[PDB]
Amino acid sequence: MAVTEASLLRQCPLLLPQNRSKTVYEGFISAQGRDFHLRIVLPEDLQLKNARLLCSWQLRTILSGYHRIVQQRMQHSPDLMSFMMELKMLLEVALKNRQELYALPPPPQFYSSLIEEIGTLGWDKLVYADTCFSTIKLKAEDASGREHLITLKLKAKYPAESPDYFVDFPVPFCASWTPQSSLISIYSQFLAAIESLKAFWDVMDEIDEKTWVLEPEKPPRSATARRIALGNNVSINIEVDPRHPTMLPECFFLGADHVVKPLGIKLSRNIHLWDPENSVLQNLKDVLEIDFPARAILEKSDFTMDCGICYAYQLDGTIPDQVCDNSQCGQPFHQICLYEWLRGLLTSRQSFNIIFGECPYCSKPITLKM
Amino acid sequence: PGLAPPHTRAPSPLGPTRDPVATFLETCRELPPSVASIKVSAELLRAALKDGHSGVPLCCATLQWLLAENAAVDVVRARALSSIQGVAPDGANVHLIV
């Protein structure tokens, strides 16, 4: 309703006015099928510019990082009615965010069905299950003999709504979810995607084996990019279409302008002799009229010796100088980039010509002396 | 009650779900509508209703003659209704069509 005599009943059923002069309300407030104790003292008139509001310590843990919010809302909100709307809305927010603490599953469907269904698959399949039982991650095999993993993140109702599927491989995966579908169903869909992309995988595996793939290190199955090295201090980066893998990619070369120019010319001249009945390597070798190095150096292949903020060597004369005092990062930077960076952080403090604060990559103490 | 002149909120009686002695006994010890109809000659009904009061020949005048003895016949005379839903003394509903 308009007025907060019926509208306040309808929108706060469990707030029982104790006093005749409706100054103390007491009892429960509702949110996400959960009721909370709440005791809300007004002054002698209906003015929230001055009011008390006490809570259960339950509710106060759940209003943590909102205290100023609520105090401002008491001062800024015209009526009690709207105040309660704002307060519920804010509870709404608070719980859904802290979703890790709050999940009472209906066992009779859940924990039994999930067991039945993992039995339906086979027990070699499942590889990880979380003790909140929210996450699972499953395994599948190629005709090749490659493992590909699938994460599922599951809700209070598994069989009702979709399970959130998180997947590696580079085309967007489609799972037709019904209430009738189950783990075996989405698993068969996932196998279908595997056996479909078989060619693209063979291309990637063939490359990684018979060449010095250099930049993506331990490649995922999602990566379309392969910065291959060849000769010395020249490289080719090659971005591939999965749907037509053997077909021609967008490509270009890094290194010496005097070394690369001839290869570009030669490529532009032989590029009509690309053929999607050969392999990518068997096309590249005879198009560019070359053989590749199979790991000319496997230990000191390359460590990216660039700024790790701006990713340039030679920013206005300056060199990658300032490093991390850490064995696991070692990452060089620039004087300019690291100063601009650390000034900005809240963790940074500046002494006379010194700036203390966190390495961008590893969050360990790093010192900059201007 | 629905047809009534005032159209006033009278509560529905709903005659008692058991006898008091029946409820006593149950405590101490522990579907379609039925229909009837008739047909009759228009000539018979015309000849009998002639002295013919007014209005539409049949169905309405038939109902006026059936309930000429009920107090709420003048109301059905005004609205000229050939089908109505009364209640009863025992609270059950009955719909009578002509």
Partner: protein, 549 residues
């Protein structure tokens, strides 16, 4: 791996044992047990056989022990205090009254320090603490001369009061506090004297300390209590268990916090702060645990092992200083009352049944599948009951909503908004005819104008008051009353009731007659004397309504 055991069980009454009286102590491997009967037992903790059973007269109320001397002091109810040599020159043994010392007879509590004995004795109105010697040479077991006496004037009288001594650092079956605290609670005097201080818990719930040094008197020299006994903090409820705790743990441990408990379950732990004014302040914390509390103890590291009637539950204080609330788990043992804590944790108790019990706290193919089966069966047993409680909750909610509306109707009615909006009840006079005679009837129309649906729990009462001026002769029928359930009225909706007022007797109607309506709410119906009655209208029928032309 059996985290419990049983040694023995006892002659329990119906329900179980009465709390406060039964006692348990562990010495080394021997265990000293009283079941709040006249009988005190001693069990070998290796083999759960009784070493020794001791028949006193009349209900042992308390024990204490001295390990050095190998002696046990024991308060018979209406007799005095009997000491037993554990050497002790059928496995039942009667005590001879020679073992009696201070037959004071009226003594309710008593405790022990080193070389000093404290009783506390009921009298008239005034309870008096005393203080005796206890002979430090291994002699004839004597009291000595009483050193002193006081009157706990503060107290004027099931629950025995309780005694705990507390010595400060530098200086024994009691407790030691830290110099900061000790100085904080008791003051310089006791600090400077290095004076033990003896805490009495009183059935009032007052928690009183007295400095012992400061209690030496004679016939010439009576103790003034107003001086000599003082009062820390008044729990409004009786006392069960006093101790103290090593919060911040970083045999004689110097504690930094002081513990009480109540029956209904206010705790009160206390601390030294030294905060916010560059000055020492005490840290009070009046928590509220569950239920009847039925005993308590202390284990290493700010962990208080207490019992309610349902469950044996623990509180942690260990880390402003200590803590906001004490939210407080079971350990899935029943009500044991009478608990003790030996420190290594291995606690011994007496269960409410009669049970003397030791709580010692801290892959396979297809057998794991049977474990899986087990766990499933468990949750399914449980789920059934979580469901039940959900529906109880729904009931409580639905009750609250109806009540909510009731308050709202009542509030609306009891305010004068200058038009009686929410509910109205008009009455109006009507002549009818019966048999022969013109009867005078009153229609009572009840109308709901407002939104509020008058659900179940509501009832209309009409009363038909005759003439006024109570007479010489009290009439036949002074008034009549009519009371009807209003059920599910709803908004806009309406009832009518007709009453006679009219000459049934004698052809005699006396006119100025009021018919007054009311509503009444019954709180019970939807689930000291308890309802509410709210006025509606009161219409006066006078001749000018009762004329017929």
């Amino acid at each position: 791996a059996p985290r419990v055991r049983y040694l023995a069980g006892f002659c329990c009454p119906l329900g179980g044992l009465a709390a406060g009286k039964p006692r348990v102590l562990c010495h080394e491997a021997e265990v000293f047990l009283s079941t709040g009967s006249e009988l005190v037992y001693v069990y070998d903790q290796e083999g759960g056989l009784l070493t020794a059973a001791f028949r006193f007269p009349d209900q042992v109320w308390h024990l204490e022990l001295l390990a050095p001397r190998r002696l046990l002091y024991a308060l018979c109810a209406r007799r005095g205090l009997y000491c037993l040599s554990l050497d002790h020159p059928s496995p039942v043994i009667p005590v001879d009254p020679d073992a009696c010392i201070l037959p004071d007879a009226a003594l309710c509590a008593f405790t022990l320090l080193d070389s000093v004995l404290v009783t506390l004795v009921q009298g008239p109105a005034r309870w008096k603490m005393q203080l005796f010697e206890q002979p430090c040479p291994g002699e004839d077991p004597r009291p000595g001369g009483q050193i002193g006496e006081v009157e706990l004037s503060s107290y004027t009288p099931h629950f025995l009061p309780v005694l705990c001594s507390v010595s400060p650092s530098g200086s024994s079956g009691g407790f030691t506090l830290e110099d900061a605290l000790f100085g904080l609670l008791f003051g310089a005097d006791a600090t400077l004297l290095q004076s033990p201080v003896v805490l009495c818990g009183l059935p009032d719930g007052q928690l009183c300390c007295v400095i012992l040094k400061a209690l030496v008197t004679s016939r010439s020299a009576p103790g003034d209590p107003n001086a000599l006994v003082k009062i820390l903090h008044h729990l409004e409820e009786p006392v069960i268990f006093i101790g103290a705790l090593k919060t911040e743990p970083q045999e004689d441990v110097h504690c930094d916090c002081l513990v009480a408990f109540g029956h209904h379950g206010r705790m009160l732990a206390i601390k030294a702060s030294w905060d916010e004014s560059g000055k020492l302040v005490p840290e009070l914390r009046e928590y509220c645990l569950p239920g009847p509390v039925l005993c308590a103890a202390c284990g290493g590291g700010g962990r208080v092992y207490h019992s309610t009637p349902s469950d044996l539950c623990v509180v942690d204080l260990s880390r402003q200083p200590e803590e906001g609330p004490g939210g407080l788990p079971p350990m899935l043992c029943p009500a044991s009352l009478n608990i003790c804590s030996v420190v290594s944790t291995k606690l011994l108790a007496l269960s409410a049944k009669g049970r003397l019990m030791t709580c010692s706290l801290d892959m396979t193919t297809e057998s794991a599948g049977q474990k899986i089966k087990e766990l499933l069966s468990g949750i399914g047993n449980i789920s059934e009951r979580v469901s039940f409680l959900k529906k109880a909750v729904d009931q409580r909610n639905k009750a609250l909503t109806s009540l909510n509306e009731a308050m709202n109707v009542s509030c609306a009615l009891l305010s004068s908004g200058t038009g009686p909006r929410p509910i109205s009840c008009t009455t109006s006079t009507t002549w009818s005819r019966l048999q022969t005679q013109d009867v005078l009837m009153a229609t009572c129309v009840l109308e709901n104008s407002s939104s509020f649906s008058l659900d179940q729990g509501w009832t209309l009462c009409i009363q038909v008051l005759t003439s006024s001026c109570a007479l010489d002769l009290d009439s036949a029928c002074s008034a009549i009353t009519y009371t009807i359930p209003v059920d599910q009225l709803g908004p806009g909706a309406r009832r009518e009731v007709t009453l006679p007022l009219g000459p049934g007797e004698n052809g005699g109607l006396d006119l100025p007659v009021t018919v007054s309506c009311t509503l009444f709410y019954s709180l019970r119906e939807v689930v000291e004397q308890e309802g509410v009655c709210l006025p509606l209208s009161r219409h006066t029928v006078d001749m000018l309504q009762c004329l017929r032309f």
